[PDB]
């Protein structure tokens, strides 16, 4: 056992040395000569009311007009944000929902939370009512995130320090991803859908191949739990928001952290993160009841979304980049632009 | 607008009405978070998530047991029922550390903890037997004496009372180390047979609401 520990320490030292030599320069000093964004002044164009408890999760549909919202009141609501209408009101079986997702086709929506089950709901069906299609049991810890790959493939991350890929038709785990020491709090599917990254409470991020089922890379730059993870639209990087009160942008081809986003006055953790269509604006939702629009290339707060009376829990963008959505503990979902 | 959009708006209005009705029905309940560890009777206090519902004096309580990030979910909850086992002393320090962690939890700075000390019957039996001495685990016990005028008992052993009060004092002065008065630890005793636990929780929740009101009025 001592020989194994020595070999592990030597391999870790080799990894650190090899990745330390690849750092010829720093993204911060490579982006010191560009045009800064300025002020990202975003007004609340719509405010969605009807949720009577903390909003925990929200996910845009593929058409950038429909969105799902899951709140602690135990109700999934589909919003037509163009006319602020309620297309559907989905009552959940458990009110401790921490994540929700919208199928790319638009026929299904996924939701999960403290019950360790990812429930799938069919929207577009005869009889004119949303109904439960499939429940995905097998995770040991609470579900932190979930994202559809297609009508029959969904990746989830749980607090048991694992991520899973599920076939919905068979409702079976095709692949299990292992290696995280802490609870996995967020997962982001790649634009190609081949890979996905996950951050956990062990203050590390890991990149996983969906088909192979192995861990291609592992990242560690945080000194606190990573609560949110979002893939850069290019698919060759990601961003992680942690309890460290900072965000951090990692790459995949370099295998080491590239940027950190922090403020002296910012001591609250980062509840959520997301990227604009350009990926040039890393939008983060904090616990201080507001969101910061970080310049992902400059790591500067070029904007603030201060309209929430409580913690911002969820923060996402449309697929066309025309609006952002922020859901807070004040029980109101807001669309900003 | 179009006739289709008029019908869509009508449907949205009906959905809003249904949501308002559901919220009005669900607003009255009081939530509680159950915390503890094994061999502590945590889940044997009242008779994914093992949520339970029980009513006392026309007040409905929803106790939630989970199975420490996720505690954020229970941030606006009435109280935390933190059960501890005061029968085994080797893990008593572990329970004290867990109590410290929960009491100082950033998300729980305003949540009063209804602290429970279980299996006091086992604790008394161990004290009577004398096989294990709390002083072996907490040396300060050897230099501890029960308060003279604050020992209301039904006629129990002075040794049992002294040990119980020592453990309770350790927990209570961990609680009051830094509380600022925004939340209070309520200690109690349970022997797995005392059915008067829901009453204690109800009284402590009433006290918590009363303290919140007084703080709003600056009377406290």
């Amino acid at each position, epitope marked *: 056992l001592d020989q194994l520990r020595q070999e592990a320490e030597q391999l870790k030292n080799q990894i650190r040395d090899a990745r330390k030599a690849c750092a010829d320069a720093t993204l911060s000093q490579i982006t010191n000569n560009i045009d800064p964004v300025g002020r990202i002044q975003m007004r609340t164009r719509r405010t969605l009311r009807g949720h009577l408890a903390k909003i925990y999760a929200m996910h845009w549909g593929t058409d950038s007009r429909l969105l799902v919202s899951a709140s602690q009141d135990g109700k999934l609501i589909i919003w037509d944000s163009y006319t602020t*209408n309620k297309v559907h009101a989905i009552p959940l079986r458990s009110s401790w929902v921490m994540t929700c997702a919208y199928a790319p086709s638009g026929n299904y929506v996924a939701c999960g939370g403290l019950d360790n089950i990812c429930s799938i709901y069919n929207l577009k069906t005869r009889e004119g*009512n949303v109904r439960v299609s499939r429940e995905l049991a097998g995770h040991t810890g609470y579900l932190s995130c979930c994202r559809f790959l297609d009508d029959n493939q969904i990746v989830t991350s749980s607090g048991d320090t694992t991520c899973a890929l599920w076939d919905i038709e068979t409702g079976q785990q095709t692949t299990t991803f292992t290696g995280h020491t802490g609870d996995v709090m967020s997962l982001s599917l790649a634009p190609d859908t081949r890979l996905f990254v996950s951050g956990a409470c062990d203050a590390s991020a890991k990149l996983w191949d969906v088909r192979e089922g192995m861990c291609r890379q592992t990242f560690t730059g945080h000194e606190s739990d990573i609560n949110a993870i979002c893939f850069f639209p290019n698919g060759n990087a990601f961003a992680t928001g942690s309890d460290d009160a900072t965000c951090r942008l990692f790459d995949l081809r370099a295998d080491q952290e590239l940027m950190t986003y922090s403020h002296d006055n910012i001591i609250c953790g980062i509840t959520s993160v997301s990227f604009s269509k350009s990926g040039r604006l890393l939008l983060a939702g904090y616990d201080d009841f507001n969101c910061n629009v970080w310049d992902a290339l400059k790591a500067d707060r070029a904007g603030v979304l201060a309209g929430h009376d409580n913690r911002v829990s969820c923060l996402g963008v449309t697929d066309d980049g025309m609006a952002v959505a922020t859901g807070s503990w004040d029980s109101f979902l807001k669309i900003w632009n | 607008v179009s*006739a289709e*959009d008029k019908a*869509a708006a*009508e*449907r949205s209005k009906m959905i809003d009405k249904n949501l308002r009705e559901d919220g009005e029905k669900a607003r009255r309940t009081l939530r509680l978070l159950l915390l503890g560890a094994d061999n502590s009777g945590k889940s044997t206090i009242v008779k994914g998530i093992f949520e339970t519902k029980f009513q006392v004096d026309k007040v409905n309580f929803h106790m939630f047991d989970v199975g420490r990030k996720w505690i954020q979910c229970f941030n606006d909850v009435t109280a935390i029922i933190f059960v501890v086992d005061s029968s085994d002393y080797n893990r008593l320090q572990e329970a004290l550390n867990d109590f410290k962690s929960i009491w100082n939890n950033r998300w729980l700075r305003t949540i009063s903890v209804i602290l429970f000390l279980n299996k006091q019957d086992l604790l008394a039996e161990k004290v009577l037997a004398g096989k294990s001495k709390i002083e072996d685990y907490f040396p300060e016990f050897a230099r501890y004496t029960t308060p003279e005028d604050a020992t209301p008992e039904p006629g129990e052993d002075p040794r049992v009372t002294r040990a119980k009060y020592f453990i309770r004092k350790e927990f209570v002065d961990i609680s009051t180390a830094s509380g600022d008065g925004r939340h209070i630890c309520y200690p109690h005793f349970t022997c797995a047979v005392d059915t008067e636990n829901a009453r204690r929780i109800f009284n402590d929740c009433k006290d918590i609401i009363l303290q919140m009101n007084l703080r709003e009025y600056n009377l406290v």
Partner: single-chain antibody
Amino acid sequence: VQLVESGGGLVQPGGSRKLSCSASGFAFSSFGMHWVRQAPEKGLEWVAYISSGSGTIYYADTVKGRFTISRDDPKNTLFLQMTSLRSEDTAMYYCVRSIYYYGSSPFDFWGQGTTLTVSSDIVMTQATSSVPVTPGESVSISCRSSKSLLHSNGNTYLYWFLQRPGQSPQLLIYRMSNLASGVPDRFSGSGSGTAFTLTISRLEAEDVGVYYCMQHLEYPLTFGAGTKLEL
């Protein structure tokens, strides 16, 4: 999804009758109901409309005042009370379901009607009252409208129904561009302002009947004359 309709029978002029439509197979409470009649040999004619929850009700000027439309959601039934029957009120009556929300298909399901015999508005026209066709050929059927059915929200409110002999109308295309469920992908629709066309490629058997185009921009709901396709 079934909509079984009852009523009909012989009626003396000037009397009254009650038509019923029992629904079974969908969330009736969430659907708005419609009544559409068809003269013995003429086209289709909208009659009435009741929305979900009975909040909004509409009638046809031709029968307004004498007709009443109601619904019993717990009983899952739709009722049409008729009063002061005229010699022009002899026809086959159908009940239709239509749910209204973003990306929905109104007039999705019709039913088998009941026969009744007694002893301004947007207008769309179909120039072709009969168009012989052959199997395997491609047929385009156009039907224009009085005004532009395009709306500010971007929806072109045109619907297509096919009525095969001895059968109820069935929806094919809704909002002039969206295919229905269960309809083979051979059918399609397209066009621009006031110019609406329906294309059928690789025409096959079981595709013979009267095509009707309908509008939904504003009440009353008016049908076309009806283009009949023969072998």
